[PDB]
Amino acid sequence: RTISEDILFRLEKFGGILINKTNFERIELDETEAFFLYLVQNHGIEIATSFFKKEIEMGKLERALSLNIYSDNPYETLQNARKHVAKLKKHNILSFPLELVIYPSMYCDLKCGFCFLANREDRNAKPAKDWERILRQAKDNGVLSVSILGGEPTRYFDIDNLLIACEELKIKTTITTNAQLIKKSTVEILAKSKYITPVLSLQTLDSKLNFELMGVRPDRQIKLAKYFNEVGKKCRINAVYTKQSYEQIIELVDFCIENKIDRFSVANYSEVTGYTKIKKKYDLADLRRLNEYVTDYITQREANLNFATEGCHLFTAYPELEFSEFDEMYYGCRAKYTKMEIMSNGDILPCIAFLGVNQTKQNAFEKDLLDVWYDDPLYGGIRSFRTKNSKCLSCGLLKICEGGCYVNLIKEKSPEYFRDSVCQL
Ligand SMILES: C[S@@+](CC[C@H](N)C(=O)[O-])C[C@H]1O[C@@H](n2cnc3c(N)ncnc32)[C@H](O)[C@@H]1O
Ligand code: SF4
Ligand code: SF4
Ligand code: SF4
Protein backbone atom coordinates (compact mmCIF):
# COMPACT_ATOMS: atom_id res chain seq x y z
CA ARG A 1 0.00 0.00 0.00
CA THR A 2 1.80 3.07 -1.35
CA ILE A 3 1.09 6.28 -3.28
CA SER A 4 -1.04 6.01 -6.44
CA GLU A 5 0.63 5.94 -9.86
CA ASP A 6 -1.84 8.64 -10.94
CA ILE A 7 -0.36 10.98 -8.31
CA LEU A 8 2.91 12.89 -8.60
CA PHE A 9 4.74 13.53 -5.31
CA ARG A 10 7.92 15.58 -4.94
CA LEU A 11 9.90 17.03 -2.07
CA GLU A 12 10.09 20.83 -2.34
CA LYS A 13 11.95 23.51 -0.36
CA PHE A 14 8.71 24.27 1.53
CA GLY A 15 7.85 20.64 2.19
CA GLY A 16 6.25 18.76 -0.67
CA ILE A 17 3.91 18.94 -3.64
CA LEU A 18 1.17 16.57 -4.79
CA ILE A 19 -0.41 16.69 -8.26
CA ASN A 20 -2.86 14.44 -10.09
CA LYS A 21 -1.31 13.26 -13.36
CA THR A 22 -4.72 13.38 -15.08
CA ASN A 23 -6.74 15.96 -13.12
CA PHE A 24 -3.88 18.42 -12.53
CA GLU A 25 -5.29 19.50 -9.17
CA ARG A 26 -2.50 20.13 -6.67
CA ILE A 27 -1.94 20.40 -2.92
CA GLU A 28 0.97 22.02 -1.09
CA LEU A 29 2.32 19.94 1.81
CA ASP A 30 4.08 20.57 5.12
CA GLU A 31 7.63 19.43 5.80
CA THR A 32 6.16 16.83 8.16
CA GLU A 33 3.59 15.66 5.61
CA ALA A 34 6.22 15.65 2.86
CA PHE A 35 8.64 13.56 4.92
CA PHE A 36 5.73 11.36 6.00
CA LEU A 37 4.62 10.77 2.41
CA TYR A 38 8.20 10.29 1.22
CA LEU A 39 8.43 7.28 3.54
CA VAL A 40 4.96 6.15 2.48
CA GLN A 41 6.38 6.15 -1.06
CA ASN A 42 9.73 4.40 -0.49
CA HIS A 43 8.28 2.15 2.21
CA GLY A 44 4.83 1.06 3.32
CA ILE A 45 2.32 3.30 5.06
CA GLU A 46 3.13 1.09 8.06
CA ILE A 47 6.85 1.92 8.15
CA ALA A 48 5.86 5.56 7.66
CA THR A 49 3.17 5.37 10.34
CA SER A 50 5.90 4.11 12.68
CA PHE A 51 7.84 7.35 12.31
CA PHE A 52 6.02 10.60 13.06
CA LYS A 53 4.29 8.81 15.94
CA LYS A 54 3.97 11.97 18.04
CA GLU A 55 2.83 14.00 15.02
CA ILE A 56 -0.06 11.62 14.32
CA GLU A 57 -1.17 12.01 17.94
CA MET A 58 -0.63 15.78 17.77
CA GLY A 59 -3.01 15.98 14.82
CA LYS A 60 -0.24 17.15 12.49
CA LEU A 61 -1.15 14.50 9.91
CA GLU A 62 -4.93 14.87 9.99
CA ARG A 63 -4.90 16.22 6.44
CA ALA A 64 -2.19 14.01 4.91
CA LEU A 65 -4.04 10.91 6.08
CA SER A 66 -7.34 12.38 4.89
CA LEU A 67 -6.27 12.16 1.24
CA ASN A 68 -7.22 9.72 -1.53
CA ILE A 69 -3.70 9.43 -2.90
CA TYR A 70 -3.00 5.85 -1.85
CA SER A 71 -2.84 2.58 -3.80
CA ASP A 72 -1.34 -0.92 -3.69
CA ASN A 73 16.63 1.64 5.22
CA PRO A 74 13.95 4.20 6.16
CA TYR A 75 16.45 6.03 8.41
CA GLU A 76 18.77 6.75 5.47
CA THR A 77 15.89 7.75 3.20
CA LEU A 78 14.52 10.16 5.81
CA GLN A 79 18.01 11.63 6.12
CA ASN A 80 18.50 11.98 2.36
CA ALA A 81 15.12 13.69 2.09
CA ARG A 82 16.44 16.18 4.64
CA LYS A 83 19.65 16.57 2.64
CA HIS A 84 17.45 17.27 -0.39
CA VAL A 85 15.00 19.77 1.12
CA ALA A 86 17.99 21.68 2.50
CA LYS A 87 19.70 21.86 -0.89
CA LEU A 88 16.52 23.20 -2.50
CA LYS A 89 16.45 25.90 0.18
CA LYS A 90 20.10 26.87 -0.33
CA HIS A 91 19.22 27.30 -4.01
CA ASN A 92 15.66 28.57 -3.62
CA ILE A 93 14.41 26.74 -6.70
CA LEU A 94 11.75 24.25 -7.70
CA SER A 95 12.79 20.59 -7.42
CA PHE A 96 12.52 19.83 -11.14
CA PRO A 97 10.60 21.10 -14.16
CA LEU A 98 6.97 20.05 -14.36
CA GLU A 99 7.18 20.29 -18.15
CA LEU A 100 9.90 18.85 -20.37
CA VAL A 101 9.92 19.87 -24.03
CA ILE A 102 11.95 17.92 -26.57
CA TYR A 103 12.77 18.60 -30.21
CA PRO A 104 14.03 15.26 -31.56
CA SER A 105 14.09 16.77 -35.06
CA MET A 106 14.08 20.38 -36.24
CA TYR A 107 13.17 19.31 -39.78
CA CYS A 108 9.63 20.03 -40.93
CA ASP A 109 7.72 19.35 -44.15
CA LEU A 110 5.93 22.72 -44.03
CA LYS A 111 6.94 26.38 -43.83
CA CYS A 112 4.04 28.11 -42.09
CA GLY A 113 4.32 31.89 -42.30
CA PHE A 114 3.61 32.28 -38.58
CA CYS A 115 6.19 29.73 -37.44
CA PHE A 116 9.62 30.70 -36.09
CA LEU A 117 11.14 27.19 -36.12
CA ALA A 118 11.04 26.40 -39.85
CA ASN A 119 13.98 25.63 -42.15
CA ARG A 120 16.14 24.99 -39.06
CA GLU A 121 19.25 22.79 -39.25
CA ASP A 122 18.48 19.10 -38.73
CA ARG A 123 21.79 17.28 -39.22
CA ASN A 124 22.58 14.45 -36.80
CA ALA A 125 19.25 13.72 -35.12
CA LYS A 126 20.00 11.24 -32.32
CA PRO A 127 18.02 7.96 -32.09
CA ALA A 128 15.25 7.23 -29.56
CA LYS A 129 17.74 5.31 -27.41
CA ASP A 130 19.58 8.51 -26.51
CA TRP A 131 16.33 10.36 -25.80
CA GLU A 132 15.26 7.35 -23.72
CA ARG A 133 18.10 8.00 -21.26
CA ILE A 134 17.02 11.64 -21.06
CA LEU A 135 13.41 10.54 -20.57
CA ARG A 136 14.40 8.23 -17.70
CA GLN A 137 16.04 11.08 -15.77
CA ALA A 138 12.93 13.22 -16.23
CA LYS A 139 10.70 10.42 -14.95
CA ASP A 140 12.97 9.62 -12.00
CA ASN A 141 13.42 13.32 -11.16
CA GLY A 142 9.71 14.10 -10.90
CA VAL A 143 8.76 15.53 -14.30
CA LEU A 144 4.99 15.82 -14.80
CA SER A 145 4.67 15.81 -18.60
CA VAL A 146 6.83 15.47 -21.71
CA SER A 147 5.85 17.45 -24.82
CA ILE A 148 7.32 16.29 -28.14
CA LEU A 149 7.69 19.13 -30.65
CA GLY A 150 9.99 20.21 -33.48
CA GLY A 151 10.03 20.51 -36.31
CA GLU A 152 7.44 17.98 -37.37
CA PRO A 153 8.14 15.21 -34.83
CA THR A 154 6.29 12.61 -36.92
CA ARG A 155 8.99 13.26 -39.52
CA TYR A 156 11.54 12.24 -36.88
CA PHE A 157 12.87 8.89 -38.12
CA ASP A 158 12.74 7.17 -34.74
CA ILE A 159 9.43 8.68 -33.62
CA ASP A 160 7.71 5.31 -33.16
CA ASN A 161 10.38 4.09 -30.73
CA LEU A 162 10.49 7.41 -28.88
CA LEU A 163 6.72 7.24 -28.42
CA ILE A 164 7.06 3.65 -27.20
CA ALA A 165 9.68 4.72 -24.64
CA CYS A 166 7.24 7.30 -23.30
CA GLU A 167 4.51 4.66 -23.07
CA GLU A 168 6.80 2.12 -21.37
CA LEU A 169 8.02 4.73 -18.87
CA LYS A 170 4.39 5.74 -18.31
CA ILE A 171 5.14 9.45 -18.73
CA LYS A 172 2.16 11.72 -19.46
CA THR A 173 3.22 12.68 -22.98
CA THR A 174 1.87 14.74 -25.85
CA ILE A 175 3.02 15.09 -29.45
CA THR A 176 2.09 18.06 -31.63
CA THR A 177 1.78 17.39 -35.38
CA ASN A 178 0.65 18.91 -38.69
CA ALA A 179 -0.74 15.47 -39.56
CA GLN A 180 0.51 15.69 -43.16
CA LEU A 181 2.68 12.59 -43.60
CA ILE A 182 2.07 10.72 -40.35
CA LYS A 183 2.88 7.02 -40.78
CA LYS A 184 0.29 4.28 -40.24
CA SER A 185 2.37 2.61 -37.54
CA THR A 186 2.67 5.88 -35.63
CA VAL A 187 -1.09 6.45 -35.65
CA GLU A 188 -1.45 3.00 -34.11
CA ILE A 189 1.08 3.65 -31.34
CA LEU A 190 -1.05 6.70 -30.52
CA ALA A 191 -4.38 4.88 -30.85
CA LYS A 192 -3.37 2.11 -28.44
CA SER A 193 -1.57 4.49 -26.08
CA LYS A 194 -2.75 5.25 -22.55
CA TYR A 195 -0.22 7.97 -21.71
CA ILE A 196 0.34 9.77 -25.05
CA THR A 197 -2.11 12.34 -26.45
CA PRO A 198 -1.81 13.79 -29.97
CA VAL A 199 -2.25 17.51 -30.67
CA LEU A 200 -3.22 18.61 -34.19
CA SER A 201 -2.01 21.95 -35.58
CA LEU A 202 -5.01 23.39 -37.40
CA GLN A 203 -5.55 27.10 -38.06
CA THR A 204 -9.00 26.84 -39.65
CA LEU A 205 -11.42 24.69 -41.65
CA ASP A 206 -11.42 27.22 -44.49
CA SER A 207 -9.18 25.72 -47.16
CA LYS A 208 -7.93 29.01 -48.55
CA LEU A 209 -7.00 30.74 -45.30
CA ASN A 210 -5.45 27.59 -43.85
CA PHE A 211 -3.45 27.21 -47.06
CA GLU A 212 -2.31 30.81 -46.70
CA LEU A 213 -1.35 30.16 -43.07
CA MET A 214 0.22 26.68 -43.27
CA GLY A 215 0.58 26.01 -46.99
CA VAL A 216 -1.76 23.00 -46.87
CA ARG A 217 -5.50 22.35 -46.91
CA PRO A 218 -6.90 21.28 -43.51
CA ASP A 219 -8.03 17.92 -44.93
CA ARG A 220 -5.54 15.57 -43.26
CA GLN A 221 -5.75 17.23 -39.83
CA ILE A 222 -9.53 16.93 -40.04
CA LYS A 223 -9.28 13.31 -41.18
CA LEU A 224 -7.09 12.31 -38.24
CA ALA A 225 -9.29 14.03 -35.66
CA LYS A 226 -12.24 12.12 -37.09
CA TYR A 227 -10.29 8.85 -36.98
CA PHE A 228 -9.20 9.16 -33.33
CA ASN A 229 -12.82 9.82 -32.37
CA GLU A 230 -13.69 6.54 -34.11
CA VAL A 231 -11.18 4.44 -32.17
CA GLY A 232 -12.14 6.37 -29.03
CA LYS A 233 -8.80 8.13 -28.55
CA LYS A 234 -8.36 11.52 -26.90
CA CYS A 235 -7.30 14.19 -29.39
CA ARG A 236 -6.52 17.90 -29.26
CA ILE A 237 -6.48 20.89 -31.63
CA ASN A 238 -4.02 23.78 -31.38
CA ALA A 239 -4.37 27.00 -33.37
CA VAL A 240 -2.42 30.28 -33.44
CA TYR A 241 -4.51 33.45 -33.34
CA THR A 242 -3.19 35.27 -36.43
CA LYS A 243 -5.77 36.13 -39.09
CA GLN A 244 -8.87 34.14 -38.14
CA SER A 245 -12.18 35.97 -37.76
CA TYR A 246 -14.56 35.23 -34.89
CA GLU A 247 -16.87 33.35 -37.26
CA GLN A 248 -14.03 31.08 -38.39
CA ILE A 249 -13.04 30.36 -34.77
CA ILE A 250 -16.59 29.33 -33.85
CA GLU A 251 -16.70 27.07 -36.93
CA LEU A 252 -13.61 25.36 -35.53
CA VAL A 253 -15.13 25.05 -32.05
CA ASP A 254 -18.19 23.29 -33.48
CA PHE A 255 -15.90 20.83 -35.24
CA CYS A 256 -14.26 19.93 -31.93
CA ILE A 257 -17.69 19.43 -30.34
CA GLU A 258 -19.07 17.24 -33.13
CA ASN A 259 -15.92 15.13 -33.03
CA LYS A 260 -15.60 15.22 -29.23
CA ILE A 261 -12.17 16.87 -29.09
CA ASP A 262 -10.58 16.72 -25.63
CA ARG A 263 -9.04 20.20 -25.60
CA PHE A 264 -9.04 23.14 -28.02
CA SER A 265 -6.21 25.63 -27.47
CA VAL A 266 -5.80 29.03 -29.16
CA ALA A 267 -2.22 30.26 -28.77
CA ASN A 268 -1.30 33.94 -28.90
CA TYR A 269 0.75 34.84 -31.96
CA SER A 270 4.37 35.50 -31.09
CA GLU A 271 6.43 37.50 -33.59
CA VAL A 272 10.11 36.59 -33.83
CA THR A 273 11.92 39.15 -35.99
CA GLY A 274 13.73 37.66 -38.96
CA TYR A 275 11.74 34.41 -38.86
CA THR A 276 8.01 35.07 -38.63
CA LYS A 277 6.61 36.43 -41.91
CA ILE A 278 2.98 37.22 -41.06
CA LYS A 279 2.19 40.52 -39.35
CA LYS A 280 0.61 40.44 -35.90
CA LYS A 281 -3.00 41.61 -36.04
CA TYR A 282 -4.27 40.91 -32.50
CA ASP A 283 -2.79 41.73 -29.08
CA LEU A 284 -3.45 40.05 -25.72
CA ALA A 285 -6.50 42.25 -25.12
CA ASP A 286 -7.99 40.94 -28.37
CA LEU A 287 -7.22 37.42 -27.14
CA ARG A 288 -9.16 37.97 -23.91
CA ARG A 289 -12.13 39.36 -25.82
CA LEU A 290 -11.96 36.18 -27.93
CA ASN A 291 -11.70 33.80 -24.97
CA GLU A 292 -14.67 35.46 -23.29
CA TYR A 293 -16.48 35.06 -26.62
CA VAL A 294 -15.80 31.34 -27.09
CA THR A 295 -16.42 30.30 -23.47
CA ASP A 296 -19.64 32.32 -23.67
CA TYR A 297 -20.49 30.22 -26.75
CA ILE A 298 -19.40 26.76 -25.60
CA THR A 299 -21.49 27.18 -22.44
CA GLN A 300 -24.38 28.91 -24.22
CA ARG A 301 -24.80 25.62 -26.08
CA GLU A 302 -24.07 23.24 -23.19
CA ALA A 303 -20.91 21.66 -24.58
CA ASN A 304 -18.31 19.87 -22.46
CA LEU A 305 -15.49 21.21 -24.64
CA ASN A 306 -12.30 22.10 -22.79
CA PHE A 307 -11.34 25.49 -24.24
CA ALA A 308 -8.34 27.69 -23.45
CA THR A 309 -6.11 30.52 -24.67
CA GLU A 310 -2.34 30.22 -24.27
CA GLY A 311 0.85 32.26 -24.21
CA CYS A 312 2.97 34.29 -21.82
CA HIS A 313 1.88 37.40 -19.90
CA LEU A 314 -1.78 36.79 -20.77
CA PHE A 315 -2.59 38.31 -17.38
CA THR A 316 -1.50 41.76 -18.58
CA ALA A 317 -4.89 42.01 -20.31
CA TYR A 318 -6.62 41.84 -16.91
CA PRO A 319 -6.18 45.10 -14.93
CA GLU A 320 -8.56 43.65 -12.33
CA LEU A 321 -5.53 42.40 -10.39
CA GLU A 322 -0.05 37.49 -2.09
CA PHE A 323 1.13 34.32 -3.83
CA SER A 324 2.06 31.07 -2.09
CA GLU A 325 5.67 29.93 -2.03
CA PHE A 326 4.82 27.58 -4.89
CA ASP A 327 2.47 29.85 -6.84
CA GLU A 328 5.27 32.43 -6.94
CA MET A 329 7.25 29.96 -9.05
CA TYR A 330 4.37 28.28 -10.87
CA TYR A 331 2.47 31.22 -12.34
CA GLY A 332 4.13 33.58 -14.82
CA CYS A 333 7.30 32.89 -16.79
CA ARG A 334 7.60 29.10 -16.81
CA ALA A 335 11.21 29.29 -18.00
CA LYS A 336 12.28 30.11 -14.44
CA TYR A 337 11.26 27.00 -12.47
CA THR A 338 8.59 24.86 -14.20
CA LYS A 339 9.91 24.32 -17.74
CA MET A 340 12.87 22.88 -19.66
CA GLU A 341 13.44 22.55 -23.41
CA ILE A 342 15.94 20.24 -25.10
CA MET A 343 17.08 20.91 -28.65
CA SER A 344 17.93 18.35 -31.32
CA ASN A 345 21.64 18.57 -30.54
CA GLY A 346 20.94 18.19 -26.82
CA ASP A 347 21.15 21.93 -26.04
CA ILE A 348 19.23 22.69 -22.85
CA LEU A 349 17.21 25.91 -22.80
CA PRO A 350 14.95 27.42 -20.16
CA CYS A 351 12.77 28.49 -23.09
CA ILE A 352 12.66 28.24 -26.87
CA ALA A 353 13.16 32.01 -26.83
CA PHE A 354 16.81 31.27 -25.93
CA LEU A 355 17.48 29.98 -29.46
CA GLY A 356 18.48 33.51 -30.44
CA VAL A 357 20.59 34.15 -27.32
CA ASN A 358 24.24 33.67 -28.28
CA GLN A 359 25.30 32.44 -24.83
CA THR A 360 26.65 28.94 -24.18
CA LYS A 361 24.29 26.01 -23.56
CA GLN A 362 24.88 22.65 -21.90
CA ASN A 363 24.32 19.26 -23.56
CA ALA A 364 21.72 16.77 -22.31
CA PHE A 365 23.57 13.93 -24.05
CA GLU A 366 26.78 14.57 -22.08
CA LYS A 367 25.58 16.01 -18.75
CA ASP A 368 22.74 15.13 -16.36
CA LEU A 369 19.48 17.08 -16.43
CA LEU A 370 19.49 17.66 -12.67
CA ASP A 371 23.04 19.01 -12.54
CA VAL A 372 22.23 21.52 -15.30
CA TRP A 373 18.96 22.34 -13.55
CA TYR A 374 21.06 23.48 -10.57
CA ASP A 375 24.19 25.14 -11.95
CA ASP A 376 23.21 26.47 -15.39
CA PRO A 377 24.07 30.13 -16.15
CA LEU A 378 21.02 30.71 -18.37
CA TYR A 379 18.64 29.51 -15.67
CA GLY A 380 20.50 31.53 -13.04
CA GLY A 381 20.30 34.61 -15.23
CA ILE A 382 16.55 34.50 -15.81
CA ARG A 383 15.85 33.30 -12.25
CA SER A 384 17.87 36.05 -10.57
CA PHE A 385 16.63 38.91 -12.77
CA ARG A 386 14.91 41.74 -10.91
CA THR A 387 13.33 44.77 -12.58
CA LYS A 388 13.58 48.32 -11.19
CA ASN A 389 10.75 49.78 -13.26
CA SER A 390 8.47 52.02 -11.19
CA LYS A 391 5.24 50.65 -12.66
CA CYS A 392 6.41 47.07 -12.11
CA LEU A 393 7.67 47.58 -8.56
CA SER A 394 4.20 48.78 -7.55
CA CYS A 395 2.46 46.10 -9.61
CA GLY A 396 0.77 43.22 -7.82
CA LEU A 397 2.21 40.67 -10.25
CA LEU A 398 5.86 41.78 -9.99
CA LYS A 399 7.07 38.48 -8.49
CA ILE A 400 5.92 36.38 -11.46
CA CYS A 401 6.49 38.95 -14.24
CA GLU A 402 9.50 41.17 -13.42
CA GLY A 403 8.80 43.67 -16.20
CA GLY A 404 8.05 41.21 -19.01
CA CYS A 405 9.77 38.41 -20.90
CA TYR A 406 13.39 38.27 -19.75
CA VAL A 407 14.70 37.30 -23.19
CA ASN A 408 13.35 40.54 -24.69
CA LEU A 409 14.57 42.68 -21.79
CA ILE A 410 18.25 41.71 -21.97
CA LYS A 411 18.26 42.86 -25.61
CA GLU A 412 17.49 46.43 -24.55
CA LYS A 413 19.98 49.10 -23.43
CA SER A 414 18.88 49.15 -19.78
CA PRO A 415 17.03 45.84 -19.19
CA GLU A 416 16.53 46.37 -15.45
CA TYR A 417 14.62 49.59 -16.26
CA PHE A 418 12.87 48.61 -19.52
CA ARG A 419 9.28 47.35 -19.34
CA ASP A 420 8.06 44.97 -22.08
CA SER A 421 5.77 46.71 -24.59
CA VAL A 422 3.35 43.78 -24.26
CA CYS A 423 2.27 45.46 -21.02
CA GLN A 424 0.87 48.95 -21.49
CA LEU A 425 -0.77 49.11 -18.06
C1 LIG B 1 6.66 24.30 -31.81
S2 LIG B 1 5.28 24.15 -32.99
C3 LIG B 1 5.86 22.84 -34.11
C4 LIG B 1 5.46 21.38 -33.88
C5 LIG B 1 4.67 20.78 -35.04
N6 LIG B 1 5.40 20.91 -36.30
C7 LIG B 1 3.30 21.44 -35.14
O8 LIG B 1 3.04 22.21 -36.17
O9 LIG B 1 2.46 21.08 -34.34
C10 LIG B 1 3.92 23.57 -31.94
C11 LIG B 1 2.75 24.55 -31.99
O12 LIG B 1 3.19 25.89 -31.94
C13 LIG B 1 2.37 26.68 -32.76
N14 LIG B 1 3.12 27.90 -33.19
C15 LIG B 1 4.01 28.00 -34.23
N16 LIG B 1 4.51 29.21 -34.36
C17 LIG B 1 3.93 29.94 -33.34
C18 LIG B 1 4.04 31.27 -32.94
N19 LIG B 1 4.85 32.11 -33.59
N20 LIG B 1 3.31 31.70 -31.85
C21 LIG B 1 2.51 30.82 -31.24
N22 LIG B 1 2.32 29.53 -31.54
C23 LIG B 1 3.06 29.15 -32.61
C24 LIG B 1 1.93 25.79 -33.93
O25 LIG B 1 0.60 26.02 -34.35
C26 LIG B 1 2.02 24.39 -33.32
O27 LIG B 1 0.72 23.89 -33.10
S1 SF4 C 1 4.33 25.47 -37.14
FE2 SF4 C 1 4.79 23.12 -37.21
S3 SF4 C 1 4.15 22.58 -39.36
FE4 SF4 C 1 4.32 24.79 -39.38
S5 SF4 C 1 6.51 25.07 -40.13
FE6 SF4 C 1 6.37 25.37 -37.85
S7 SF4 C 1 7.18 23.45 -37.27
FE8 SF4 C 1 6.42 23.01 -39.38
S1 SF4 D 1 5.36 44.25 -16.92
FE2 SF4 D 1 5.35 45.37 -14.99
S3 SF4 D 1 3.22 46.20 -14.70
FE4 SF4 D 1 3.08 44.70 -16.37
S5 SF4 D 1 2.42 42.79 -15.38
FE6 SF4 D 1 4.67 42.69 -15.44
S7 SF4 D 1 5.45 43.71 -13.52
FE8 SF4 D 1 3.19 44.20 -13.66
S1 SF4 E 1 11.42 33.37 -21.25
FE2 SF4 E 1 9.87 34.75 -22.20
S3 SF4 E 1 8.90 33.41 -23.90
FE4 SF4 E 1 9.94 32.04 -22.47
S5 SF4 E 1 8.22 31.43 -20.94
FE6 SF4 E 1 9.55 33.10 -20.01
S7 SF4 E 1 8.26 34.92 -20.66
FE8 SF4 E 1 7.60 33.22 -22.06
- The CA distance from 218 to 340, in Å, is 31
User: Per the annotation, where are the binding residues?
Assistant: 108, 112, 114-116, 152, 201, 203, 238, 270, 312, 333, 351, 392, 395, 401, 405, 423
Is residue 11 included in any domain, yes or no?
yes
Measured from the Cα of 149, ligand 1's closest atom is 4
Report how many domains make up the chain.
Answer: 3
For residue 175, the cross-strand partners are 148, 198
Structural domain ending residue among the three candidates 356, 375, 406: 356
Structural domain ending residue among the three candidates 356, 377, 405: 356
- Atom 3 of ligand 4, residue of closest alpha carbon: 353
User: What's the half-sphere exposure (Cβ side, CA atoms, 13 Å) at 156?
Assistant: 30
- The CA distance from 169 to 42, in Å, is 18
Ligand 4: centre distance to CA 173 (Å)? 21
Is residue 361 included in any domain, yes or no?
no
- Considering the domain architecture, whether residues 343 and 392 belong to the same structural domain is answered as no
For residue 265, the cross-strand partners are 238, 308
Q: Which residues line ligand 2 (CB under 6 A)?
A: 108, 110-112, 115, 117-118, 150-152, 178, 201, 214
Q: Burial of 217 by CB count in 10 Å (0-12 exposed, 13-18 middle, 19+ buried)?
A: middle
- Considering the domain architecture, whether residues 293 and 401 belong to the same structural domain is answered as no
Resolution in A: 2.5
- The CA distance from 334 to 329, in Å, is 8
Is residue 379 included in any domain, yes or no?
no
Other beta carbons less than 10 A from residue 406's beta carbon: 26
Q: Which method was used?
A: X-ray
* Intra-chain end-to-end CA distance of the chain, in Å: 52
Contact present, 201 and 214 (Cβ < 8 Å): yes
Is residue 376 included in any domain, yes or no?
no
- Considering the domain architecture, whether residues 84 and 104 belong to the same structural domain is answered as no
Q: Which residue range is the domain that position 398 belongs to?
A: 386-425
- Considering the domain architecture, whether residues 224 and 167 belong to the same structural domain is answered as yes
Measured from the Cα of 116, ligand 2's closest atom is 6
- The CA distance from 202 to 266, in Å, is 10
Ligand 1: centre distance to CA 355 (Å)? 15
- Considering the domain architecture, whether residues 240 and 319 belong to the same structural domain is answered as yes
Is residue 185 included in any domain, yes or no?
yes
Is residue 381 included in any domain, yes or no?
no
User: Per the annotation, where are the binding residues for S-adenosyl-L-methionine?
Assistant: 114, 116, 152, 201, 203, 238, 270
- Atom 6 of ligand 4, residue of closest alpha carbon: 333
147 — phi, psi (to 5°)? -95, 125
- Considering the domain architecture, whether residues 66 and 22 belong to the same structural domain is answered as yes
Ligand closest to CA 406:
4
Ligand 3: centre distance to CA 312 (Å)? 12
Is residue 153 included in any domain, yes or no?
yes
- The CA distance from 296 to 308, in Å, is 12
- Considering the domain architecture, whether residues 35 and 105 belong to the same structural domain is answered as no
What CATH number corresponds to the domain at position 277? 3.20.20.70
CA angle 220, 223, 229 (to 5 degrees): 145
